Amino acid sequence: EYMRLRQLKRFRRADEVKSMFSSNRQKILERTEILNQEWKQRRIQPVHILTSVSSLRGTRECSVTSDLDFPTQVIPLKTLNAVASVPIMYSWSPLQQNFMVEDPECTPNIDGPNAKSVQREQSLHSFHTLFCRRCFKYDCFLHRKCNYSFHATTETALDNKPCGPQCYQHLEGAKEFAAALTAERIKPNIEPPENVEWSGAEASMFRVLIGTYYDNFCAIARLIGTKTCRQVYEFRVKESSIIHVYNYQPCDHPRQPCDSSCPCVIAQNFCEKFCQCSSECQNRFPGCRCKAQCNTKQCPCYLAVRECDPDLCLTCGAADHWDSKNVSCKNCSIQRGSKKHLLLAPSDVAGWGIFIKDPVQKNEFISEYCGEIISQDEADRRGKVYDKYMCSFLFNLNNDFVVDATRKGNKIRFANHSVNPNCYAKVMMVNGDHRIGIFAKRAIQTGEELFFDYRYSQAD
């Protein structure tokens, strides 16, 4: 019964492994034959292994005592010259921005010969479930939100005259029928229509494009293949007959405006561009009409300890000259990602230390303390792991966000600690996200190691 089947399976496995071992042994014998042929191609120089000299330098001699019945040979010790050591450290992955750490199946492809009609969930579900509108990426690492979407789930003039080929407007009595069927969707087409076969992909693309262009016919025919405007009207008619600063989380509540019922109002944050509220929202942040440099402590941005939103602060300098050097507004350096060069060397205090290549004036951007974004419990776990060897790099960014740069960070991770720091760090909300920037407390000199007070962070 079961025992017999198990025994048969065991015998089959034994035969298979025996055959595999025999084949591997044959291959290994062939490879060792060619290897030994290569080895015997050339001999080696005679290594007589002479016993050096007899106290050439007059130093101590080695007392190699043979525990058997043999005399104790004596050989002077040939000491080896010393080599400079290097402070201990672990490997890490270079990184510039942040990186958060997590803690009937589908419609067919229009690409390829195989195609059909998709209308159960419209025709656009592959490119809609995965979206990161903040920085326009597909399945972004920066914003791994709840992601409710899952499992891959206007006035214009009439097109008068038959533009190019025959148009649907040029048809005798079709525009009034079109007006009628859009009115009901809130002489006429009496001529019989044509009968032309339409592929599934073509039909799906036509439906998707008609879902947006609507009454437009010339352009929707131009983008499509063939797709006669008269035929387009034919399918349109047929279809009707057939049928304590937190992250700036965007708001899309249609029940009521942003007033005591909005996450942004709850989070006391300005409704940025990604918010789906009205353009005249109360929480909307007025931009800067600043002349330059946006460093007047007054600037509502500076008063709110905030960056300059490119879509709101327009003349301030947060939008003009994107692909260039540092902009006129000094409250945009961290958004552009431009920082100061840093170096690595053995610290004069302990371990490694970061020495800046160029002098930094008072309150001037130096670097960004990026790394891996982890949760508070994940921050505790990572900090314990790092402190197991007595070296922690955990830093506080937001109320529930912690930046760690042990396994992944930048050169600014090795910041020295001193009672008279030469640098200081402040948190600024950049484009709806929180970042940590490095600033010089005084006019630091060239090449001096940067000092950072650890009392500001959770771990001092």
Q: Which residues bind a copy of itself (CB under 8 A)?
A: 285-292, 294, 296-300, 303, 315
The nearer residue to Zn ion, 330 or 411, going by C-beta atoms, is: 330
Shortest Cβ 135–Zn ion spacing (Å): 4
Q: Which is nearer to a copy of itself, 258 or 370 (CB)?
A: 258
Q: How far is the CB of 287 from Zn ion (least distance, A)?
A: 6
Report the nearest approach of a copy of itself to the CB of residue 296 (Å): 5
Strands 73-76 and 61-64, by their bridges, are antiparallel
**Least distance (Å) between residue 268 CB and a copy of itself:** 16
Binding partner of 275, given Zn ion, a copy of itself, none, CB within 5-8 angstroms per partner class: Zn ion
Nearer to Zn ion, 167 or 430 (CB): 430
State the binding partner of 331 from a copy of itself, Zn ion, none, CB within 5 to 8 A by kind: Zn ion
Closest approach, Cβ 203 to Zn ion, in A, equals 34
Determine the Cα–Cα distance for residues 115 and 201; give it in Å rounded to an integer: 5
Of 9 and 291, the one with the shorter C-beta distance to a copy of itself is: 291
| The token pair that represents 82 in the structure block | 């010393």
Report the partner that residue 245 touches, choosing among Zn ion, a copy of itself, none (CB closer than 5 to 8 A by kind).
Answer: none
Using CB under 5 A, pick the residue from 205, 290, 379, 444 that binds Zn ion: 290
Which residues is 306 bridged to in the sheet? 429
With residue 232 as reference, give the H or E element that holds it.
Answer: helix 229-242
Please, which residue, 174 or 429, has the CB nearer to a copy of itself?
Answer: 429
**Residue 286 site contact among Zn ion, a copy of itself, none (CB < 5 to 8 Å, cut-off depends on kind):** a copy of itself
Collapsing DSSP states into helix, strand and coil, what is residue 120? strand
Nearer to Zn ion, 143 or 382 (CB): 143
Closest CA to 316 of 344, 340, 294, 335: 294
Residue 421 CB, shortest distance to a copy of itself, in Å, is: 22
Taking a C-beta distance cutoff of 8 angstroms, is the pair 399, 376 a contact?
no
294 binds Zn ion (CB under 5 A): yes
Nearer to a copy of itself, 179 or 292 (CB): 292
Return the one option of Zn ion, a copy of itself, none that residue 291 interacts with (CB less than 5 to 8 A, by type).
a copy of itself
Structure tokens at 244: 């304590």
Q: Judged by CB under 5 A, which of 9, 13, 60, 137 binds Zn ion?
A: 137
Q: State the minimum distance, in angstroms, from the CB of residue 92 to Zn ion.
A: 23
Distance, CA of 204 to CA of 115 (rounded, Å): 9
Would you say 292 or 345 has its CB closer to a copy of itself? 292
Strands 73-76, 342-346: parallel, antiparallel or unpaired by DSSP? unpaired
Report the run of H or E that residue 39 belongs to, with start and end.
Answer: helix 2-39
Shortest Cβ distance from residue 257 to a copy of itself (Å)?
A: 16
Nearer to a copy of itself, 264 or 403 (CB): 264
DSSP 190: -
* CA nearest to 247, candidates 145, 95, 141: 145
Name the binder of 450 from Zn ion, a copy of itself, none, CB < 5-8 A by kind.
none
Cβ-in-10-Å burial (0-12, 13-18, 19+) of 111 comes to exposed
Report d(CA 155, CA 162) in Å as an integer: 20
Q: Which residue is nearest to Zn ion (CB)?
A: 299
- 314-322 long-range contacts, CB within 8 A, separation 24+: 314/287, 315/287, 315/288, 315/289, 315/290, 316/287, 316/288, 316/289, 316/290, 317/292, 318/288
Sketch the per residue contact string, 313 through 332, with Zn ion: x for CB under 5 A, - otherwise: x--x------------x-x-
Each residue of 206-240: b (16+ CB within 10 Å) or e?
Answer: bbbbbeeeebebbebbeeeeebbbbbbbbbbbeee
Partner from a copy of itself, Zn ion, none contacting 428, C-beta within 5 to 8 A by type:
none
Select from Zn ion, a copy of itself, none the partner in contact with residue 135, using the beta carbon and a kind-dependent cut-off of 5 to 8 Å.
Zn ion
In the complex, the smallest distance separating the C-beta of residue 95 from Zn ion, rounded to whole angstroms, is: 15
With contact defined as beta carbons under 8 Å apart, do 385 and 359 qualify? no
Residue 451 near residue 328, CB atoms below 8 Å:
no
Q: How far is the CB of 258 from Zn ion (least distance, A)?
A: 3
Q: 193 and 228 in contact (C-beta within 8 Å)?
A: no
Give exposure, 406-423, as e/b (b: 16+ Cβ within 10 Å). Answer: bbbbbbbbbbbeeeebbb
> Shortest distance, CB of residue 370 to Zn ion, whole angstroms?
15
Residue ranges in 253-282 that form contacts with Zn ion under rule CB under 5 A: 258, 262, 264, 271, 275, 277, 281
- The tokens for 147 are 């992601």
Stretch that binds Zn ion, among 13-21, 142-150, 205-213, 345-353 (CB under 5 A): 142-150
Instruction: Summarize as ranges the residues that interact with Zn ion (CB under 5 A).
Output: 132, 135, 137, 140, 142-143, 251, 258, 262, 264, 271, 275, 277, 281, 283, 288, 290, 294, 299, 301, 308, 313, 316, 329, 331
